[PDB]
Amino acid sequence: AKLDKEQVIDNALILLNEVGMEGLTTRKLAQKLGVEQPTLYWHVKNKRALLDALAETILQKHHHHVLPLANESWQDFLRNNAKSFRQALLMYRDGGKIHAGTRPSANQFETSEQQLQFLCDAGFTLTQAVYALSSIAHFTLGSVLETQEHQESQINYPPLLTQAIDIMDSDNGEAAFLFVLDVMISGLETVLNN
Amino acid sequence: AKLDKEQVIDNALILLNEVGMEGLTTRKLAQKLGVEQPTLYWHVKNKRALLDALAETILQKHHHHVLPLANESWQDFLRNNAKSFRQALLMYRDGGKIHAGTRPSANQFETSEQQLQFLCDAGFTLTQAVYALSSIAHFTLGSVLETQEHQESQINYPPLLTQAIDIMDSDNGEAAFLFVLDVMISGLETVLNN
Numbered sequence: 001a002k003l004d005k006e007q008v009i010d011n012a013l014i015l016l017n018e019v020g021m022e023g024l025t026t027r028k029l030a031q032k033l034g035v036e037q038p039t040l041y042w043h044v045k046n047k048r049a050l051l052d053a054l055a056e057t058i059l060q061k062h063h064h065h066v067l068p069l070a071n072e073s074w075q076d077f078l079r080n081n082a083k084s085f086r087q088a089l090l091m092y093r094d095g096g097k098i099h100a101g102t103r104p105s106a107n108q109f110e111t112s113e114q115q116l117q118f119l120c121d122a123g124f125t126l127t128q129a130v131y132a133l134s135s136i137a138h139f140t141l142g143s144v145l146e147t148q149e150h151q152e153s154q155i156n157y158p159p160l161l162t163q164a165i166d167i168m169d170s171d172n173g174e175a176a177f178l179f180v181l182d183v184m185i186s187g188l189e190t191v192l193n194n
Numbered sequence: 195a196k197l198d199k200e201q202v203i204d205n206a207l208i209l210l211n212e213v214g215m216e217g218l219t220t221r222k223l224a225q226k227l228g229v230e231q232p233t234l235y236w237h238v239k240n241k242r243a244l245l246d247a248l249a250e251t252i253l254q255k256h257h258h259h260v261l262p263l264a265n266e267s268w269q270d271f272l273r274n275n276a277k278s279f280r281q282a283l284l285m286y287r288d289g290g291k292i293h294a295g296t297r298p299s300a301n302q303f304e305t306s307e308q309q310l311q312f313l314c315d316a317g318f319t320l321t322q323a324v325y326a327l328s329s330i331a332h333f334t335l336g337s338v339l340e341t342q343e344h345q346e347s348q349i350n351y352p353p354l355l356t357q358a359i360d361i362m363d364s365d366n367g368e369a370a371f372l373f374v375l376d377v378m379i380s381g382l383e384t385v386l387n388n
Contacts, residue, residue, distance in 0.1 A: 146294060
């Protein structure tokens with residue numbers, strides 16, 4: 001057959017888990033596909049384009065809470081959107097690092113617009129809606145980077161710090177994530193007050 | 195002279211700006227120092243140990259709001275700690291990526307303990323204090339990763355999304371960062387209520 005983009009990206013996702021972000025290169029991916037680099041080039045012009053395509057595909061495949069459910073409040077929508085995002089980023093090795101800085105793809109323009117419109121319809125200004133979505137994206141990304149790096153690891157701390165480390169690490173940052181997510185929702189409610 | 199750790203790390207910081215995180219390798223750093231790898235080994239046993247040392251040194255050199263100022267409220271302390279952190283992470287190429295997952299070093303144990311004690315003294319439970327500090331760290335890290343990747347880059351979006359991109363990018367995420375930081379503070383105030 002012809003080499004198609006889905007075939008390229010599915011093979012790349014496999015390779016990402018096998019070797020990690022740093023290890024992933026277009027040379028290696030070409031080898032895996034049994035083509036030469038000029039052939040792969042038409043699909044992914046360089047490593048950064050490859051990583052962008054991986055990031056987009058991981059969300060498309062695994063980040064499903066991208067619109068509010070029927071009757072869902074904006075509070076529940078942000079909460080569930082964040083949880084869905086976090087789980088999607090945790091699906092692949094270096095998933096957080098891969099995601100950072102990427103934009104929505106063409107197949108996500110529609111739902112990204114609807115998110116913004118939804119929040120505006122809830123009473124947020126456009127600026128406040130943009131910032132609210134950024135709050136969830138950035139906090140979630142930071143949370144995932146932290147847990148992935150701690151996991152990826154394969155000493156006498158003071159006592160409060162020793163408890164702190166145990167509190168963050170013992171569930172891979174889940175409880176802390178939930179707590180902050182409710183903190184953010186409550187602070188946004190406060191923004192809507194004035 | 196003898197090769198000392200400060201000399202190793204200062205040279206590594208230079209190399210980090212020159213080549214980036216991915217490009218940075220112990221082979222290249224050995225070359226820069228004019229030593230062989232077994233000699234460098236005694237300082238940094240591998241790349242991950244090198245990156246940990248860079249992360250720690252960048253905070254030591256540039257992240258100065260690590261304790262509350264005389265008379266500072268916990269609200270102002272978290273705000274200024276976050277701002278100080280963000281600026282420190284932006285000082286170096288891939289500063290955000292480098293930082294992710296690292297722990298405080300021995301020279302930061304004292305101030306990390308005092309941060310926790312301070313928040314407890316303000317009325318936070320230890321668990322709430324740990325989570326509050328995580329909220330600032332993770333959100334700030336996500337904010338910096340996003341701006342660094344957008345900058346590091348060297349198309350018809352729908353209209354709200356087009357405005358969203360402009361709102362986030364036009365000041366490298368500064369206004370959004372400030373807004374969320376106040377959102378987090380307000381939500382934490384709400385936590386202290388109950």
